Amino acid sequence: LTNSSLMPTLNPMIQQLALAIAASWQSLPLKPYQLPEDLGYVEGRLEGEKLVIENRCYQTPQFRKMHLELAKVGKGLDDLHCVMFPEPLYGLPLFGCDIVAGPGGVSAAIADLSPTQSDRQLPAAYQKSLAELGQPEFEQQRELPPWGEIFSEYCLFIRPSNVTEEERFVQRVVDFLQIHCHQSIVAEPLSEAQTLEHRQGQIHYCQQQQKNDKTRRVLEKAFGEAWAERYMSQVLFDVI
Ligand SMILES: C=CC1=C(C)/C(=C/c2[nH]c(/C=C3N=C(/C=C4\NC(=O)C(C)=C4C=C)C(C)=C\3CCC(=O)O)c(CCC(=O)O)c2C)NC1=O
C-alpha cells in the first residue's frame, strides 16, 4: 500500500484496517485476479462530487477472489470494502468488511465471517474460535437491514464511539483474519454435493449484498445507474 494514492488521505481507522488486511495477505501464495476490464484505479463525476476508487485483487487456491477496495468521494466520504470470496471446494466462510467515514469520523464499521452452508451456520471450528474471542462491547451498535440476514451471529455493525472502540474493532478484524487464514490451511476439498452447497451460499451472499442501496447511490451519483449496476454486479458482488 506504499504506492496508494488514496491511503495518505483516508480516515485513520480505514488506514489501519487496510494495512491489517494487506499484512494478512502478504505472505500467501497470491496470484493476480483480473477484475473486469483489468480495473485498478477509477474516477468519475456527474453533477456533483467526484468518486475515486483504488482496487487491488488477488486469488489463492482457497480464495477465489480477494478484493480490497479504497474509495473517497470529494473530501467528505471515505470507504474501505473488502471481501475474501472462498473457493467453494474448501467450504470456507466469506470474510468481509465495509468501513464508511466522513470528516466527523467513522459512521459505519461492519465486519464478518459469513456462512455459506445451507443451515446458515459457520463451520464448527469457526464457531469455537470466534466464541473464544469473547463478546466485544460497543456503545453504538447498529441493526442490520433485512438483506443482512446473510451475516453470521459474530457480525459487527457499529458506529465507533471513541478511539478505544476503533482499536477494538480493528483488533477484532485482525482476529477474524487470523482465524480465517489458519482454517484455510486445515481445509480439505469437499464432496461435490458440499461444494455445490457452498457455491449456493456464496451466490446468495452476493445477491443480497447487491440490495445495499446506500452503496449503490454513492456509485450512481458519480457514474450513473448503468455503471453502478455493472460495478455492483460484476466488480463488487459477482455471482458465480
Ligand atoms: C464502492 C464501494 C462501497 C461504498 C461506496 C460503500 C458505501 C456504504 N456502505 C454503507 C453501509 C453498509 N455496508 C454494509 C455491509 C457491507 N458492505 C460491503 O461492501 C461488505 C463487504 C459488507 C459486509 C461485510 C452494511 C450492512 C451497511 C449498512 C446498510 C444500511 O444501513 O442500510 C453505507 C452507509 C453508511 C452509514 O449508514 O453510516 C455507505 C455509504 N460500501 C462499499 O462497499
From Swiss-Prot:
Reaction(s) the record says it catalyses: (2R,3Z)-phycocyanobilin + 4 oxidized [2Fe-2S]-[ferredoxin] = biliverdin IXalpha + 4 reduced [2Fe-2S]-[ferredoxin] + 4 H(+)
Highest taxon listed in the record's lineage: Bacteria
GO biological process: phytochromobilin biosynthetic process
UniProt KW Cell cycle keyword: no
Entry keyword Oxidoreductase: yes
Intrachain S-S bonds: none
EC annotation from Swiss-Prot or TrEMBL: 1.3.7.5
Gene Ontology MF terms in the entry: cobalt ion binding; phycocyanobilin:ferredoxin oxidoreductase activity
Pfam families: Fe_bilin_red
Keyword terms: Oxidoreductase
Signal peptide: none
InterPro entries membership: Ferredoxin-dep_bilin_Rdtase, Ferredoxin_bilin_OxRdtase
Coiled coil start-end: none
Family: Belongs to the HY2 family.
Stated role: Catalyzes the four-electron reduction of biliverdin IX-alpha (2-electron reduction at both the A and D rings); the reaction proceeds via an isolatable 2-electron intermediate, 181,182-dihydrobiliverdin.
Record's protein name: Phycocyanobilin:ferredoxin oxidoreductase
Species name: Synechocystis sp. (strain ATCC 27184 / PCC 6803 / Kazusa)
Species classification: Bacteria, Bacillati, Cyanobacteriota, Cyanophyceae, Synechococcales
